[PDB]
Design a protein around this ligand. Sequence first.
Ligand SMILES: Cc1cc2nc3c(=O)[nH]c(=O)nc-3n(C[C@H](O)[C@H](O)C(O)COP(=O)(O)O)c2cc1C
Ligand SMILES: Cc1cc2nc3c(=O)[nH]c(=O)nc-3n(C[C@H](O)[C@H](O)C(O)COP(=O)(O)O)c2cc1C
Ligand SMILES: Nc1ncnc2c1ncn2[C@@H]1O[C@H](COP(=O)(O)OP(=O)(O)OP(=O)(O)O)[C@@H](O)[C@H]1O
Ligand SMILES: Nc1ncnc2c1ncn2[C@@H]1O[C@H](COP(=O)(O)OP(=O)(O)OP(=O)(O)O)[C@@H](O)[C@H]1O
Ligand SMILES: [Fe+3]
Ligand SMILES: [Fe+3]
Lengths: 484, 484
Amino acid sequence: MRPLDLTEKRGKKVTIYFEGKELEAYEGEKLPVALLANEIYWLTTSNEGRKRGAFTFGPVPMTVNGVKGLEARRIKVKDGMKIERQGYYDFHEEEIERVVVDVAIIGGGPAGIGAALELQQYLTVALIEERGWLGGDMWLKGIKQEGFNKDSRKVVEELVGKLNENTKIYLETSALGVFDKGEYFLVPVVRGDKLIEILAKRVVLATGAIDSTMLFENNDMPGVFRRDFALEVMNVWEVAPGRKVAVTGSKADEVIQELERWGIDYVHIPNVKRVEGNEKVERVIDMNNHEYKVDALIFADGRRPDINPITQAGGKLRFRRGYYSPVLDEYHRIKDGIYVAGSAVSIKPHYANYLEGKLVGAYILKEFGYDAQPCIYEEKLREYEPESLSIPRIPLDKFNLEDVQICGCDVSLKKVDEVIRKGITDLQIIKRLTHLAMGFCQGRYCLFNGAVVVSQRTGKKLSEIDLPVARSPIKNVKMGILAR
Amino acid sequence: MRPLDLTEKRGKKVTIYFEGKELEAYEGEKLPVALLANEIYWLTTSNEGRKRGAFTFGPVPMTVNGVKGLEARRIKVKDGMKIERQGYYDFHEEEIERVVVDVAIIGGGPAGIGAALELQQYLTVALIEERGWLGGDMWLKGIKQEGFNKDSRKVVEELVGKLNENTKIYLETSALGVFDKGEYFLVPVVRGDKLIEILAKRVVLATGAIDSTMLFENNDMPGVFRRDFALEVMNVWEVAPGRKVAVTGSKADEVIQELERWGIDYVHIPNVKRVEGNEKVERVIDMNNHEYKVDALIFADGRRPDINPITQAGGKLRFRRGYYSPVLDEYHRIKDGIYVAGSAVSIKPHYANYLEGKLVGAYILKEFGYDAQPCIYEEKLREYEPESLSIPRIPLDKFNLEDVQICGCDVSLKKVDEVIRKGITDLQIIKRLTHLAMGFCQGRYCLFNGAVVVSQRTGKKLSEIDLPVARSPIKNVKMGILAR
Ligand SMILES: Cc1cc2nc3c(=O)[nH]c(=O)nc-3n(C[C@H](O)[C@H](O)C(O)COP(=O)(O)O)c2cc1C
Ligand SMILES: Cc1cc2nc3c(=O)[nH]c(=O)nc-3n(C[C@H](O)[C@H](O)C(O)COP(=O)(O)O)c2cc1C
Ligand SMILES: Nc1ncnc2c1ncn2[C@@H]1O[C@H](COP(=O)(O)OP(=O)(O)OP(=O)(O)O)[C@@H](O)[C@H]1O
Ligand SMILES: Nc1ncnc2c1ncn2[C@@H]1O[C@H](COP(=O)(O)OP(=O)(O)OP(=O)(O)O)[C@@H](O)[C@H]1O
Ligand SMILES: [Fe+3]
Ligand SMILES: [Fe+3]
């Protein structure tokens, strides 16, 4: 057992080296998780000298066997592996498959599975998921779940269990976007390092929501965990974020329930001002200047639909219930032939998103001439009012602005605030002046916040501040993979 | 075979007497039909001396064995029976059951049966029908029907076939209205001469549409058949309206198809001005003064929802698509707890009205806690656009107004036109001055026409001329039956 193991691992034991030090890991574990288990948090430094971990926004470039600039999260641990830290900008110096399919479902959470289950009654589908497992956010929980009155992870197993050979599953697979060729849609997809082109008649974006990022002082430092990452390490791998854990944000109960299940000690800090520490977090300070000693901070401030795949697919947005949503016709369509389902549509219980996927799959099944009954899913859905999110009042005056990070790359809240103060309110321009939303997330974890700041400094309402649209490759792909 | 028999009848032969004359009839036949078969049309005279039959608006009081004032349509023929004509106002001088039920469905056409079929999965229903058979208007057809791609009367048999013991059927049973007691509804019902009180939690009005009445000169004279009566005698009993038949109105094809099936010769007169003859029709004259020799005229100018049971139940009306309809909430409710289904709601194919009955039954099943799926019926219904009806321009200037009858009782078009000409436009007042809608139909076959006349003479739009509401007993009941 390593110090942060929640279980004794029974996988094949393996040995790796971090900065020369000999560490034990298990086969199949991903680099940052093996290092966490061994109490190692600080994995890289940004170009302007900011220490960083793997469990919040931003990329983790690491030298993995003399090969510079590999992404830590993507790398499985391997016996004899030589791992080292490096600069942010340090790079290394040194057979297309075509598959035709009826629908192409992007995203493998409850919505995606839902759609696939409905669809494979008669059609051939691609279920595309970049994640390596086929649950959704649901596979991150293991707490009993409403709707299917049954344990979160047990439901996923049941559902995956029910998939046909009519469903081609694509794990560890990144969709690069959707391209309408009139007669079909092209969804180019990357798995391992092969490019696969999926030509489909229909598409469904079952694309999910992403966790909102909280603005407080060293919010990027090692040992801060965004909700999803904390749940992943605890529930998927079985590793604690730390020995004693601070928890914050408006959905902190979801996290606390997991902590309690695993018996991980914690404090609940409703309003975080700052985190401090040399390599990692060791104190958090609240808005009343109270300090708490802890090894990690976990924040959970609500999920918001990931709008990138929507807007690259050519969909339009609406602001409602504290977040941006897809504008849909009466059939959950973004545009003719592209359906949207799940937490991509709105925030609501897993079961609801599951139904919406079935709903969306049923419409296309009806399109195809099969006798489906989308409305039974429709009427089940209405039983679930979509959730709201409070819009954050960022106490700008009360923060030391250069310490609070807005995006992954450079980009402090101060830089953004500065340009707004000089009159610029158009996010298009803000994007260019500061590098907000130009980093390796494409604004996923910062655009909305940038908007909130403009809105706050301006008085201009959020339902009027329109968002820069997502462009060509919605996910990072390198570049060799795309020739010839 | 009698002269107007379409088949040789194999029922028990019986013998009756009309005005002394010995006639042959069959057991189970109703008086006016036996007399028609024997070429007898003129059955009574109105108080102001107008000869009348049984196949258009108005009552048929007859002396049936020295008992004056019995209603011809209601009387079954019986061996030795002595039948005579009489004045309109000639009258004779000389154990309540309580049944509690979940729903009480008023009207036994496809809508009613539809509702009952849905409902008896779990609930106990009363299916109430005054008609003696359980089809609807559908049982009047015997032509292949859309929806259930199958012969009209064969579908009825199939459907009735499927009724449980959870459905109490009440044939030859007149509902007197609906009375909300909060904790339940009272639907008093008359069968034979017993009064039955049905106490139900829910009610559905599956009440039907009635055939519109055409305004032309002697439109009340013997040998004029309203669509429904012509179909009844031909298809239910098997007796021809006449040897050679004139057909008119905008739904004349429905009738012509039946005529052709039975091989009954006919002429199609698109625009009738007048019918003439001593005892019966013998000529019809068109708007261009062309004459045709015939034995009967059949008119079919569209059905309109019967609004009486609706308004006595306390529902409100809307004018759309050329006719008055119930105002419904989003659940086909007139008012809490009273559902409306079928051609009572709108004009559309039998199959659609069948679905609407299932729809309505499913909602109440959901109300009761059972898991029903009203929406599958919902979405099937949308496949059927409700039909329109042209609003008639009555050529008032071109008619001899005192010959064209508006209501059953006295009441010529002239009487109505007169009062309108003297400034009165409120139907409330018209009702009182002339006796329009005070006869033994309660305006069923004349209110709308009265409105059309006002509208035509006034310029005032029909969607603004509101209709006198139906009151206490929606159907005639006598009076002894209601003590003690
Ligand atoms: C000189 C220049 C540099 C740019 N650098 C970046 C960049 O570093 N990251 C990025 O995501 N986009 C970059 N862009 C693309 C901008 O997002 C660009 O204004 C754009 O995408 C146009 O807006 P649209 O894509 O919404 O139409 C750059 C564009 C220009 C002209
Ligand atoms: C003197 C008098 C005679 C009436 N005669 C008849 C009648 O012969 N037939 C009929 O249906 N209603 C008759 N009524 C009832 C009218 O329809 C009456 O104005 C009425 O119903 C009130 O309108 P409401 O029922 O719509 O509230 C009569 C009412 C009065 C006062
Ligand atoms: N471009 C992409 N390529 C492949 N997978 C993607 C892409 N974008 C998003 N996804 C995946 O879609 C999945 C979204 O599932 P998620 O569980 O978040 O939402 P859901 O299925 O609507 O239901 P719920 O939000 O309640 O779990 C995530 O697993 C995410 O990795
Ligand atoms: N007060 C009443 N008591 C008993 N029966 C009634 C009463 N009022 C109307 N009805 C009956 O309701 C039935 C209506 O059925 P009808 O077939 O006209 O309409 P439907 O079932 O909606 O479908 P469709 O119009 O297509 O046939 C008729 O048989 C009529 O006699
Ligand atoms: Fe970024
Ligand atoms: Fe009348």
